[PDB]
Structure formats: C-alpha cells, structure tokens
Design a protein around this nucleic acid. Structure first.
Lengths: 91, 17, 90
DNA sequence: TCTTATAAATAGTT
DNA sequence: AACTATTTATAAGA
C-alpha cells in the first residue's frame, strides 16, 4: 500500500470495517486460487468483532466439516503465535 | 446430511475431547 | 510473478507441491494479519489432494469451531463459484 | 533452494 | 467508492 503498516489492532471504527471487508475478500480470493491450483479442499470461518459469522468453502462447507470429524490422526496445526515466530526468524 | 446435523455432529466430536 | 498464471490445476506434481507450501503460508499469514488488524476470530481447514490435514486458528481451533456450531443464523457464505462470479463482475 | 523480475494486494488520499 | 503509489506475494530461473 501507500505505506507499510504495523500489524496492530486498528482502533478507528471506519478504517477497521473498510480494511476488514477488503482483506476478507483478498483472503477468500487467495483461498479460491489455492484450492484450484493445488487441488486442495479449504473451509474458512471468520467471526468479526461484532460476533457476526462469515464463511467460505472451496466446494461445500459440510463435506469439509464432515471430513474433519472423521480425521483421527496427527496433523499440522498453526496459530498466530507460530506465524509471528516464523516471521521473526525470517528477519 | 443437514447443515445443522453436521454442525451438531461437529459439536459432539469437539466436546468428546 | 515472473509470468502471470491462470487459475487451474497445476499438472506438474513438484511445482504443485512447491506452490501448495508457499501459498499455504501466504494464506495463513494473511489470516493472521486480518485477525489482529481487525480483531476477529479465524479458523482455517485445508485437506490437500493427499487428504492430509492442515489447520490454522487465530487463537484456538476447538474454541472457534464450537462457536460455529452454536451460530446457525443467516450470515455470509461463499464458494469458489461465488468468488469466480465476483471476479467476472469486477 | 535462492533470488528476482513481475504480478497482485492494498493504505492512504481523495 | 475510486484511484494509485507503494508494499507484498510469488513464478520461474537458478
């Protein structure tokens, strides 16, 4: 963008909503592209601060959610902490 | 598979752990 | 990047795997940023073609998934078809 | 695997 | 909302 920003909670109500809408679409667009390019299944669940639900699924949410419950074994799991740490040790 | 039926199935599986 | 690509299945297996790993991180990084910048809760579930499971959650997966099961109310719902539609119309 | 040229996302202005 | 200069992500070479 016009400037680099810090990854910190935006307190201005209007910028938060504008950014939320913009980046949520960006995020879904990238999920679309990833599912198609690499033939993967992807479900994405977002609750905004107002606790409203937004959802995306490459094909169908319930198939993915079903696939998830039947998954017994060890997987890869990441959270914001893991992502931040990985970025720190990119330098 | 209802939408509520897989959600309700998801609910069980979580609470079961 | 060096050449623009069309969004269609990559047939070369090894470029597909390289692209999966890089773009998977890209997606998770964008989710992290959206989650902190706008203070929202996000969960992400990925099954690759080999049906291996990859997951991301802003805070705790089980927490987010559970709240999802309690929320059935009318919300936004998108699929690849919807995105492809919005891209046509943009 | 690394770098880098180039495409894609987007912050700020308006 | 539009636009756009700039940041970021990434395809391809290596």
């Amino acid at each position: 963008g016009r400037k680099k920003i810090q990854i910190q909670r935006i307190t201005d109500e209007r910028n938060r909503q504008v950014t939320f809408t913009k980046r949520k679409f960006g995020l879904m667009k990238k999920a679309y592209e990833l599912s198609v390019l690499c033939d993967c299944e992807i479900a994405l669940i977002i609750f905004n601060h107002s606790n409203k639900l937004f959802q995306y699924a490459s094909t169908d949410m319930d198939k993915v959610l079903l696939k998830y419950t039947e998954y017994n074994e060890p997987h890869e799991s990441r959270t914001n902490a893991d992502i931040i740490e990985t970025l720190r040790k990119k330098g | 598979w209802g939408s509520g039926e897989v959600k309700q199935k998801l609910q069980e599986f979580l609470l079961s752990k």
